Amino acid sequence: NATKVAVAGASGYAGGEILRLLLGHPAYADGRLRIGALTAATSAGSTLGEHHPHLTPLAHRVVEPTEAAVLGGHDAVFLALPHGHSAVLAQQLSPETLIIDCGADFRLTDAAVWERFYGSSHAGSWPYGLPELPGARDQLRGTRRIAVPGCYPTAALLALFPALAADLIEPAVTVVAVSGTSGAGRAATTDLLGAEVIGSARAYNIAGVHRHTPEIAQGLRAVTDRDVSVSFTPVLIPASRGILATCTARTRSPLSQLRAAYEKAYHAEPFIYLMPEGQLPRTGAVIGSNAAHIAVAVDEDAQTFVAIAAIDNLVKGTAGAAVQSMNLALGWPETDGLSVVGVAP
Amino acid sequence: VANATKVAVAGASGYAGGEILRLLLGHPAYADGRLRIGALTAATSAGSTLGEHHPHLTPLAHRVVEPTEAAVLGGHDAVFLALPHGHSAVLAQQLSPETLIIDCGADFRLTDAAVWERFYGSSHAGSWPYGLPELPGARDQLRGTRRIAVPGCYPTAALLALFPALAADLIEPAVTVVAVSGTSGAGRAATTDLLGAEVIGSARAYNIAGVHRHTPEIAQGLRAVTDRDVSVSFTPVLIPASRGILATCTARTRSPLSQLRAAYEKAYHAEPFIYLMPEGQLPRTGAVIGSNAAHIAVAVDEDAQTFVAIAAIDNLVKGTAGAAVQSMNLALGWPETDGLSVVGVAP
């Protein structure tokens, strides 16, 4: 009253998307939320329009250096750096400031797993910003700390958790997830160039080396008592946004039981849409929305459960999750600023 | 060995037909006068010119499309039935039986009548030599054949990715394949779901959980290399590209990576179209577009006790028309690589 919000990493894709959502948030329109300092590690002194020409209402804002002093004096701070490490910065801010970290530093609950995959000391763990996971909403209500999930784990966990929690599939899961290129971030490399990406698909970081692998495992372990294993293969495709996760696991359960488990899990979840029978998700349908579209099936011959989930990697996969969780932290309606209606075609 | 081979293409106006024609135009036997391009036919559009369907094929743009009828297809030494999604048993029966008949469709691919009837809803017609020369035993069946059943595009990628590991008994026979495909694999019949505005910027799985008809075709090729009971979980995913398949293929394993790599070396070291990626490299469909190559890498996820094989092909070349031409070369006693480059057109 009013809630003054800073965004660190404002010039990146996640930062831009948080800002897009905040501009459309009812708390912004009625004055209860103010957009304050917009910061970046380089390009201080540049204007936001130079980075985000779609954000014309903020085009004139001058980007400031990312430092604790600049971020101080805000009620909420988004650390909009999904690929960055914000433990050092986060430690300099008050426990009473709401910090929403888009990065990985506070996602994991096992220090040994952290050290193995990230090669640094474990900073700790904050409430995980996936409100639909069992128990997660309770953790987020009134929190002043949020660790936003990775984009791929968001899709895979939404696809898989209801089946595993109901003990209807085996705990060895396979996930092959296609993703648009914005999930790779805004740092220019030759491999992310348009000419390279357009008209091509490639798997990367395969066979368990992708850092989101243990993150999927952690979310699944939380809903079962069994040893979880995850085979996760990400595939870059020629789209700017979207993740379509194809998730499989062996099953002994009939389709009717699995379908019922998903209906029960998601029937009162405003962002999670279970496809009518005979329809399947498409990433095009969710772009620009905070929705996840989910369908499930059983391959009887292969004794295999198949779950498909589509999300916008930048919305439900990143910035939408961040805002959704922010709403919960602040006691605002969870759906504020977050449409379920995709911008298609 | 063939010396004058006049070729017809039935279904010339579709993607497979256009690609066969592209390859024939670039074939050394075309340039030296041994391979001659005859009748080009389609079910509708007779009287139109080829350029109205395939503006890339300018040397043939003026050719007039003829009706797909046995009488028109007569007097050709080879006939490509270039309908990957069609059923050509009826037409094939009408051709002079000495003709080299190369069917891009499914009617002669499968070897189990009950499986055929289950997935295709008709009586099994039988089987012809499968046009995937790199599969164990396949090349021998193609030499001098007058009949070729061209493989489906997805089975091509999945079988190349998986067969060496399974043949060596180094992975479990329950396999998972999630394959991304450009939209040309769905064919050229105009539907809303295949419209540019729909496909651009979107990805979707389709025909999931064992309903896709390429599922039993993958199973069949795998059953040929093992005595174990094979199962296949196959999910195809359409992505916003015109061409390419990237198949991600997995199965449980407890075998060292080095033994798996040795199986791929054994299978592919003398196969000119199959490229095993250098260490630290992975396939990309961009690298094989417009080539007859498959690029393959393998890995082991130790924590998940899972083998991962990635295969990239151009769905229209190694997945369709290149397979057809490769098999044609074998049928006619011509060098297998004739007209078929391993070099992709990238970016």
From Swiss-Prot, chain A:
Q: Which UniProt keywords apply?
A: Amino-acid biosynthesis, Arginine biosynthesis, Cytoplasm, NADP, Oxidoreductase
**Where does the record place it?**
Cytoplasm
Active site: which residues?
151
The UniProt entry's sequence similarity note says: Belongs to the NAGSA dehydrogenase family. Type 1 subfamily.
Q: Which reaction does it catalyse?
A: N-acetyl-L-glutamate 5-semialdehyde + phosphate + NADP(+) = N-acetyl-L-glutamyl 5-phosphate + NADPH + H(+)
Listed GO molecular functions?
Answer: N-acetyl-gamma-glutamyl-phosphate reductase activity; NAD binding; NADP+ binding
Q: Which GO terms describe its biological process?
A: L-arginine biosynthetic process
Q: What class of enzyme is it?
A: oxidoreductase
- Species classification: Bacteria, Bacillati, Actinomycetota, Actinomycetes, Mycobacteriales
The record's annotation in InterPro entries points to: AGPR_AS, AGPR_type-1, NAD(P)-bd_dom_sf, NAGSA_dehydrogenase, Semialdehyde_DH_NAD-bd
Question: What GO CC annotations are associated with the protein?
Answer: cytoplasm
* Name of the protein: N-acetyl-gamma-glutamyl-phosphate reductase
Spell out the SMART domains in the cross-references. Semialdhyde_dh
Is ATP-binding included in the keywords of this UniProt record?
no
UniProt cross-references to HAMAP family, sorted A to Z = ArgC_type1
Described by its record, this protein's role is as follows: Catalyzes the NADPH-dependent reduction of N-acetyl-5-glutamyl phosphate to yield N-acetyl-L-glutamate 5-semialdehyde.
Pathway linked to the protein: Amino-acid biosynthesis; L-arginine biosynthesis; N(2)-acetyl-L-ornithine from L-glutamate: step 3/4
Q: What is its EC number?
A: 1.2.1.38
